Amino acid sequence: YYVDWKMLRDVKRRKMAYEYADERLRINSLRKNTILPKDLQEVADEEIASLPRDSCPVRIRNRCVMTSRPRGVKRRWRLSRIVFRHLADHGQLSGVQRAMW
Amino acid sequence: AGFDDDGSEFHEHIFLDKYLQDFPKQGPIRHFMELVTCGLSKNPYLSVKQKVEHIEWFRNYFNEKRVILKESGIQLN
Amino acid sequence: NHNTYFALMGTLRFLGLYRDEHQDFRDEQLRLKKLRGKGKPRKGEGKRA
Amino acid sequence: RRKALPPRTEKMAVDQDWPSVYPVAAPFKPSAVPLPVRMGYPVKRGVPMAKEGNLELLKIPNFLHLTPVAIKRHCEALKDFCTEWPAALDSDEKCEKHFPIEIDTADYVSAGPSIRNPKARVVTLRVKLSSLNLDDHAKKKLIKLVGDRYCKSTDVLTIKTDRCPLKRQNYDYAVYLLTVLYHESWKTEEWEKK
Amino acid sequence: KNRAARVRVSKGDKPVTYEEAHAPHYIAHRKGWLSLHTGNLDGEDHAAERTVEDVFLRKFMLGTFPGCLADQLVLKRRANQLEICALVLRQLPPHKFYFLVGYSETLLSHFYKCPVHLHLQTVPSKVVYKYI
Amino acid sequence: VDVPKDMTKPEITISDEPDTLYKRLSVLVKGHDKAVLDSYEYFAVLAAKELGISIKVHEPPRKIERFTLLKSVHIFKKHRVQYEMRTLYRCLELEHLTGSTADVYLEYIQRNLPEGVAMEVTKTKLEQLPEHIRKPIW
Amino acid sequence: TVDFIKKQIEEFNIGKRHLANMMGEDPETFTQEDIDRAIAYLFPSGLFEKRARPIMKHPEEIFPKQRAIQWGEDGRPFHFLFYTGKQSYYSLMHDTYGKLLDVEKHHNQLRAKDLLAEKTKILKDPIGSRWLIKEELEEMLVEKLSDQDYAQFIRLLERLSALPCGATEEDFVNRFRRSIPIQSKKQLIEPLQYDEQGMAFSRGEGKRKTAKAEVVVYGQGSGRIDVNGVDYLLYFPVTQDREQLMFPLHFLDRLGKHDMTCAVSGGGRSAQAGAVRLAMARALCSFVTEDEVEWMRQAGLLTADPRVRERKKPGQEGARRKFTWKKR
Amino acid sequence: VFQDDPYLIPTSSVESHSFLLAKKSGENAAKFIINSYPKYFQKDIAEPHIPCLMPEYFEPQIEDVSEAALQERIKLNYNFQQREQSEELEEATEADNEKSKTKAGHHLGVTWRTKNNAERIFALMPEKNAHSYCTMIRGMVKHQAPTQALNLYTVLLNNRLRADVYTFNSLIEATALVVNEKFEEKWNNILDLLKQMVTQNVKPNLQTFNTILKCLRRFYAFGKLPALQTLREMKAIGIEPSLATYHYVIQLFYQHESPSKGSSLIIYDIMNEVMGKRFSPRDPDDDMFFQSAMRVCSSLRDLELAYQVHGLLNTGDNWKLIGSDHRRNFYYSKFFNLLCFMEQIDVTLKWYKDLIPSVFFPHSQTMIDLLQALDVANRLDMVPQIWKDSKEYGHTFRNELKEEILMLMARDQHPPELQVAFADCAADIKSTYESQPEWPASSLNYVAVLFLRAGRTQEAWKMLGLFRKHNKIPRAELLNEFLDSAKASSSPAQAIELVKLASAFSLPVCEGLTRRVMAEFTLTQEQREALGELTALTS
Amino acid sequence: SFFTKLTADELWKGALAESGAGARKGRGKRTKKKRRKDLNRGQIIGEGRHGFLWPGLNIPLMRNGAVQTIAQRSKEDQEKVEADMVQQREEWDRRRKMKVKRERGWSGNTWGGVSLGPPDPGPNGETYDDFDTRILEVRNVFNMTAKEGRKRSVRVLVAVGNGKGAAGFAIGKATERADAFRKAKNRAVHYLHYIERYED
RNA sequence: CCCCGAUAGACCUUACCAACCCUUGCCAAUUCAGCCUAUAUACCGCCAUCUUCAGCAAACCCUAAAAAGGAACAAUAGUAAGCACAAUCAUAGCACAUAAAAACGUUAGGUCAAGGUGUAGCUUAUGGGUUGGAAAGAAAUGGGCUACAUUUUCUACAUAA
RNA sequence: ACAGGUUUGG
Ligand SMILES: [Mg+2]
Ligand SMILES: [Mg+2]
Ligand SMILES: [Mg+2]
Ligand SMILES: [Mg+2]
Ligand SMILES: [Mg+2]
Ligand SMILES: [Mg+2]
Ligand SMILES: [Mg+2]
Ligand SMILES: [Mg+2]
Ligand SMILES: [Mg+2]
Ligand SMILES: [Mg+2]
Ligand SMILES: [Mg+2]
Ligand SMILES: [Mg+2]
Ligand SMILES: [Mg+2]
Ligand SMILES: [Mg+2]
Ligand SMILES: [Mg+2]
Ligand SMILES: [Mg+2]
Ligand SMILES: [Mg+2]
Ligand SMILES: [Mg+2]
Ligand SMILES: [Mg+2]
């Protein structure tokens, strides 16, 4: 299984964002411009709204990989602030040490 | 090592004006598509076929939506 | 792929290569609970029956 | 039934070639090292731990395969693959007169399954404008055409290309940019009269 | 009181290893890192891709060699091939040790799409550093 | 006493294509500790003096990344835990190298490169002029 | 563990032989000077503690030592105070008290014969000799020492010193004296160089609060400063910063006797002034005598300013400012 | 390949043979798990996309199309045969290309089914002759039915289609293996087949001349003349022969060498002419070549040529020339057989520490040659150094090897410099057998003479009393020697028990033991005991 | 969820709660039972749920001179093997149940008058083999500390005597019973009397 | 404790609620999963406090008996491994300072909601999904920013306007 | 009585 149902849903959110990333990337070019008339922009707005909800990368939440904690997770290690300590104080990550200056 | 990018060169990536012939030259369509061409030329992440597919998507979208461009007041083909 | 992780670990455990102490602890605790008399009810007889 | 075999220490010859025992990178197995080494923080009444089962001796990288003897033995056989450097290009003054164009290409290494590094696509081209055949108006036009990429104090034009994915494609784009700039620096159009 | 990676003081009879005998504030001072790679550098990337594979192997080897593994693993990462150094007790027969090392070198390599080396060092018992 | 005989059998051919020349080969080695970097510097110097490379080695400044996290689990913000990541640099400046020499040197270096360090290679590829710039008139 | 010590000696000898062999140096000329470097190179263990690094020295240095034999084969203790607990400390106390009684009787005989040929050797102000410390006494006497016993020994030494000492009594008192670690805190003066027909040339370096400054002074020209190509008056508009530059020159009366060029990097409006002041003070030593250099280093011109900004602490504002601690 | 840890280093040859199989049993087990669960390894992380680390698939792609199922089942025995029926049930016409591979898939793996499939080659569709003999000729040689193979040659000759090299590479063997009181007809037929192979514009390959040579080794001992004639004819063509060609010639020369010692010189000169160039194992039959070229040297006692045979193998490839270790264990053993006694003891000891512990462990044969080499040159300082290794290398052969390792001490003298080793070699042997191992009586005579000149009587007297309780008594010469030792050490109380424990068992030299005890007691002034022993042996 | 699992040692330490904050002064003692059962006690490494006989773990590596291939048991013997495993589980408690008995001095459940053997030899090298010792009293002494509360300490009286008139007694107090007995035996030799015995 | 979980809330986050849907419902399978259900007064993992306080302590010895205690420096029965302190380490040279560290324990202190958990409770629901809302201030209060000016405000500007 | 169990943090 996964860590939590929240993480299971977030995986599907990321998958749907990767699936419909091209369509939104092509449609937003019709809205974020000022050369083309607004008549087609108002239609492109409805078209991109007709897309499924989980297709936008905005619903993607950066959780942890080990415990799927919704907050307090570094972006480089993708680990929670507590699992990162539990591993660093064990010494399974190179270069990490107690800051002493 | 192990990635040849289909043996393409810089003229297949940067110079993409060859795919904008099926568009009105003096209309706003060229003004809109020059930005897409510059963005695709400044994108080392995508290949040539994906940029061709984007150009074709725009072509068929604009060719399917013919009533909106005629209603907007600017004559487009 | 946490699903791949769990499936690989469980298949190895059932084939006799991996020995998951946590899963063995869960199974021992469930065995002791069912021996004591409080197990998992069958689906469909918990509320009505 | 348990069997205890003595290590190689009792069989190591004092004149034995060490690269023969440690040719490549090894995890520092104490069974093949006849040197008694003690690593670790000692005790108030004790001594540093022995080499047997010492985790700190496996934590640290070993250079036992890169002793000076092995370094010389390996570098002696590498004289066949290399070529001779031209002694007529020791000073950079003649190097600039002969090969004025400098091509900076970045290459990175990293341990792991992936090799692709997006920092490797950048290609720099440095050209000294004092080694070309531009005229006065051509140089004055090239300055305003390249903008800030030309250092007036150093008299060097720097073109940093990153638009092409492949490094060879960026190199071709850089040489095309140099060619098209050298060609356009001479064309006097209608707007240059005003 | 700090508890992270710190074993508390018993009556004076428990055997502790050189790693557990040092508080977490001794990393890079007296004890070294159990894992070596490039992801934990300044201008480098792939910090989590190696960390998840490190934790997975920490669990995999612990499940593969149960009761006979003395200390933690040494996970070196050098030029596309990863080395796993282990301190194992000589409880299992050599045939069963070779079976497992040959199974691991062929399973983990195909599971992570990278060459794996597995080095085993047999100790008679857990080496005790402090009081025992 | 029992030494193998006829152990040399390489495949080296001389191609008619002119070898590429290089002005400066910069090697930026980043690591965590200084002992590995010093051993690697000694190894590189020993490998370069045999080949006649005249390597210039200087120590670039270090870079330390520090980050602060909470100390307890649920609610304790006045007490923190700060972690540090050091990065020590070594600059190997090679000059007057050829294509084959640079290839064999980089091979012999990256084959024995340690596990705890990374290396960035910056090459100064020498070239005189392309064909459309020597003396063209539009 | 004598057999263990001998086995470790043999192992160290054979390992040193094999280390010399694998390193390629001559084993006869192979000593600890090469052993340390070879070990540090072959095991590049980068740690913050040198004692935790791998080290292979002689077993007599690795394993600690202890007290020698006190009694022979017959069991009779050698020393006459073995049953006192500290056969060394109490013997030293007894010998000191005996020498004190001897000096007392000698001085009494001299006073009776009306002869005062001794002097007071207690005033050790120009020498800077201090008494031993607990560690300096426990490194001499192998056994441990107590603080009260150390204080008693020091007070007995000062009692003996407060009386006219004899010929060997002076050495007996001074053998338990430790002076300054170097006793030569006087700094070295850079020789006067002459670069490109330029006489009275000197160079100095200064630093204060992350501000590094280098000064090049010529003692032959007029009195002026060149700060990074621009004038000092325009570089330092505040009066304080110009007083910082005038301070080293006014003390030496070299206002219009030295032309200096300063280059400073880092700091603010006062850190740069302090760094240039320190560099100028350290550079002007080549033009003055030793007594004026001593006067400057006593006035603080040749001493750096270790007062730097302290790192901020977690949960605080300026490494000292704590938050509002509410009692309730 | 083995792990350097002492607990995992192989001690004996059987352990070295077992550890590799144990590791491979884990390797192939992990490979089977990967093949059974490919979905756990589909994710690719490596950029170069190494295909060898990808899971394999043993299922076809299409199950409905017969032409698509045949091409997938021919490459992945029973399923390939069932696909043929599944294709023939739908009345589908199969071409001559899929049928060839379908027949080859059966001729590679696999009597009645062979005929049932061979009829499916001609009766259903006229399969090409070029694909018929590549299957039937090679499938019948393992089924031992060559009478049908010769008819296919006539069929392909009548169909005006040429015969390839692989045809004659097997037909000559098929016609040679059948001999019924006639050896000339088959050779004449082989010659008539060669004269037609050279006529049909098909050049004979190396295997063409190798297969005819492989058949002349098991029939006649005088058949070396045509074997050398074809060898010269192949040299006349310009094709350098591989090791498999010379292997059969040296094998026949080794068969003809036992009665006549002349073929050895021919072997040596042809081997010296071959060893001048670096070869490459381009033939899978290049394994027994060295097994024979060193067996001839070990049989005819030529170390000057054993050195050349050893220098030839490590010229191009020291390891790619031998496939199995069954040949290596017999190779190095028979090499050290000559190397122990032929050359100097220094050379023997210098080649011992490099080949015995590292390359391979010796067998029970060379361990006796080591004793012979240490006995012919009177080397005693090496006996305790070789026996400590023999303890680990010959523990399975110790019970059948110990009766010859200890006799070397009684034939030589006992210098007073090796008295500690003389005691250690006896203790490490005797203290281990009494805790379980037939104990030979000759070892007591050695443990007596090792301590006689060493001057240790208290430790030597217990070993004599320990064996007398083993329901076996040694010869009385040992008693007469220990009696001289006791009368020289002045201990008369020990002989009154020896004479009593010998008289009750009636040693054949008891009348001499009774004479020696009298002289001992007269020397030590014990006539009372001399008479008391007679009064005790009387009753 | 494979990363969410932990070590069996931590699992048992969290389950039994031997280091609880309530069991320090004595707020526990309600459920006065603590047992940690080893799960890997009789767990063969090779056997699995599917019953695959690996040539290196379950079955030997070589049979009849040839190697052994990968085989799997049928669904008739693995069940009996699991039944034997359950039998061994239910017998585990029978193995670790035995109290080494000895001779009784005064009553069957006391240490008064029981024998303890000759005392340990002195540091100078003297051995007391002719001496015989007996335990006269055993008592569990408690002390109220500041943190641990009740501090159970064993104090015992031990007498020594050889039988020729030389004898003595001593008191040994320690934490462990085996240590208190040893201390009493070692301290009883230092205090010896001589009893004048008329006609012995 | 009060800019604390949260170094971060339009949907997701979010464990809350209302409307509607699914019940071997993430895994190969399990009369099985899954619960942010209760118990922090069962836990581990992590910490707050005395706390820059130093004390803890196995092995011996002594007491006109010993439950226990063991100290007088012009010294009266105290020695002692190791854990604390100290030293060492880091702020790239010393010293200093800072940083780091601070055992055994008290507060049944905080954390079942980082994560796993024994016990006690759910299985057509206290489980799994979709959509919409999660206000607002009668009132009190903690901590920060702006200031209440002339040592001030604006302008260009290193500080002479 | 040849005695033993039973108070209490002890
Ligand atoms: Mg959970
Ligand atoms: Mg009873
Ligand atoms: Mg606050
Ligand atoms: Mg919401
Ligand atoms: Mg919602
Ligand atoms: Mg819920
Ligand atoms: Mg609590
Ligand atoms: Mg103290
Ligand atoms: Mg006491
Ligand atoms: Mg102590
Ligand atoms: Mg400290
Ligand atoms: Mg320092
Ligand atoms: Mg300090
Ligand atoms: Mg602190
Ligand atoms: Mg509470
Ligand atoms: Mg509170
Ligand atoms: Mg709750
Ligand atoms: Mg939970
Ligand atoms: Mg009472």
Residue F76 C-alpha to ligand 3 middle, in angstroms? 10
Q: Please state, in angstroms and rounded to a whole number, the distance separating the CA atoms of residues I111 and I178.
A: 12
Place of tokens 């033995």: D73
The distance of Cα A92 from the centroid of its chain, to the nearest Å, equals: 27
Q: What are the structure tokens assigned to B28, written together? A: 């706003």
Burial call H8-33: b when 16+ CB within 10 Å, e when fewer: bbbeebebbbbbbbbbbbbbbbbbeb
Number of structural domains, chain A? 1
Neighbour count for residue E72 (Cβ, 10 Å): 22
Q: Please state, in angstroms and rounded to a whole number, the distance separating the CA atoms of residues E75 and E53.
A: 10
Q: Please state, in angstroms and rounded to a whole number, the distance separating the CA atoms of residues E111 and H43.
A: 8
Q: How far is A101 from chain F (nearest CA, A)?
A: 10
Q: How far does the CA of G235 sit from the C1' of J158, in Å? A: 9
The answer as to whether A99 is a domain residue is no
- Phi and psi at residue H201, to the nearest 5°: 65, 35
**Which helix or strand (DSSP H or E) is residue H296 part of?**
helix H288-300
Which bases of chain K are contacted by protein, using any atom under 7 A from a CB? 9-10
| Residues within 7 Å (Cβ) of strand K | I 139, 141-144, 150
Taking 3-state DSSP, the helix, strand and coil percentages for chain C, each rounded to the nearest 5, stand at 60, 0, 40
Residue F74 C-alpha to ligand 17 middle, in angstroms? 14
Does H314 touch chain F if contact means CB atoms closer than 8 Å?
Answer: yes
Q: Please state, in angstroms and rounded to a whole number, the distance separating the CA atoms of residues H408 and H411.
A: 5
Are F12 and D81 in contact by the 8 Å Cβ rule? The answer is yes
Does E107 touch chain I if contact means CB atoms closer than 8 Å?
Answer: no
Neighbour count for residue H315 (Cβ, 10 Å): 17
Q: Do H40 and C8 touch (CB under 8 A)?
A: yes
> In this complex, which chains have at least 3 CB pairs below 8 Å with chain D?
B, E, F, G, H
- Phi and psi at residue H432, to the nearest 5°: -95, -20
Collapse the DSSP code of A52 into the 3-class scheme (helix H, G, I; strand E, B; otherwise coil) and give the result.
coil
Secondary structure tally for chain F: helices H, strands E = 2, 5
Q: What are the structure tokens assigned to H204, written together? A: 């004979």
Q: How far apart are the first and last CA of chain B?
A: 45
The amino acid occupying position I179 is D
Which chain F residues contact residue G314 at CB under 8 A?
A: 68, 78-80, 82
Q: How far is D110 from chain H (nearest CA, A)?
A: 13
Q: How far does the CA of G248 sit from the C1' of J159, in Å? A: 24
Nucleotide nearest to I149 (CA to C1'): K9
Collapse the DSSP code of H523 into the 3-class scheme (helix H, G, I; strand E, B; otherwise coil) and give the result.
helix
The tally of CA atoms less than 13 A away on the side-chain side of residue E50 is: 27
Are D133 and F135 in contact by the 8 Å Cβ rule? The answer is yes
Q: What are the structure tokens assigned to E81, written together? A: 């091939």
Q: What are the structure tokens assigned to H17, written together? A: 């043979």
Q: How far does the CA of G321 sit from the C1' of J148, in Å? A: 26
Residue A17 is part of a domain; what is its CATH number?
1.10.287.1480
Collapse the DSSP code of D58 into the 3-class scheme (helix H, G, I; strand E, B; otherwise coil) and give the result.
helix
Q: Please state, in angstroms and rounded to a whole number, the distance separating the CA atoms of residues H408 and I42.
A: 52
Place of tokens 């899929």: H98
Are G273 and G167 in contact by the 8 Å Cβ rule? The answer is no
> In this complex, which chains have at least 3 CB pairs below 8 Å with chain G?
D, E, F
Q: Do I3 and A1 touch (CB under 8 A)?
A: no
- Phi and psi at residue H132, to the nearest 5°: -80, -45
CB contact set of H415 (below 8 Å; sequence gap of 6+) = H380
Chain I residues within 8 angstroms (CB to CB) of chain E: 2-3, 5, 7, 40, 45, 54-57, 61
The answer as to whether A101 is a domain residue is no
Resolution for this PDB entry, in angstroms? 4.2
**Which helix or strand (DSSP H or E) is residue B70 part of?**
helix B67-71
The amino acid occupying position I61 is L
Q: How far does the CA of G230 sit from the C1' of J143, in Å? A: 49
Q: Do D115 and B14 touch (CB under 8 A)?
A: no
In Å, what is the CA distance from G34 to each residue of D17, D22, G28, H67? 20, 21, 12, 76
Q: What are the structure tokens assigned to G171, written together? A: 């050495």
Structural domain containing residue A33: 1-91
Which bases of chain J are contacted by protein, using any atom under 7 A from a CB? 1-15, 23-29, 31-36, 41-50, 57-62, 65-68, 73-75, 80-84, 88-125, 127-131, 142-144, 158-160
In Å, what is the CA distance from H529 to each residue of H465, H524, H533, I185? 21, 11, 6, 53
Q: What are the structure tokens assigned to H134, written together? A: 């590549």
**Which helix or strand (DSSP H or E) is residue G201 part of?**
strand G201-207
The answer as to whether A98 is a domain residue is no
DSSP type of residue G314:
T
Q: How far apart are the first and last CA of chain E?
A: 24
Does H32 touch chain I if contact means CB atoms closer than 8 Å?
Answer: yes
Residue/partner pairs of I19-24 with CB below 8 Å, 24 or more apart: I24/I147
Spatial CA neighbour of E24 closest among A91, H392, B13: A91
Does B1 touch chain H if contact means CB atoms closer than 8 Å?
Answer: yes
In Å, what is the CA distance from G25 to each residue of A97, B17, G20, G28, G84? 38, 70, 6, 9, 53
- Phi and psi at residue H50, to the nearest 5°: -65, 115
Q: How far is C17 from chain E (nearest CA, A)?
A: 7
DSSP type of residue D153:
T
Are D114 and H45 in contact by the 8 Å Cβ rule? The answer is yes
Are G42 and D64 in contact by the 8 Å Cβ rule? The answer is yes
In Å, what is the CA distance from D170 to each residue of B5, B8, D124, G120? 13, 12, 9, 88
CB contact set of F16 (below 8 Å; sequence gap of 6+) = none
Q: What are the structure tokens assigned to G172, written together? A: 């007996």
The distance of Cα G264 from the centroid of its chain, to the nearest Å, equals: 30
Which chain G residues contact residue F35 at CB under 8 A?
A: 40, 44-47, 53
Q: Please state, in angstroms and rounded to a whole number, the distance separating the CA atoms of residues D114 and H49.
A: 10
The answer as to whether A97 is a domain residue is no
Q: How far does the CA of G47 sit from the C1' of J22, in Å? A: 60
Instruction: Say if E and A touch: at least 3 Cβ pairs within 8 Å.
Output: yes
* Experimental method reported for this structure: cryo-EM
DSSP string over chain I: -GGG---HHHHHHHHH-TT-SSTTTTS--SS-------TTSS--SS--SS-EE-TTTTS-SEETTEE---EE--TTTHHHHHHHHHHHHHHHHHHT--------SSSTT--TT-B--SPPPPTTS----S-EEEEEEEEEE--B-SSS-B--EEEEEEEEE-SSSEEEEEEEEESSHHHHHHHHHHHHSSS-EE---TT-
The answer as to whether A13 is a domain residue is yes
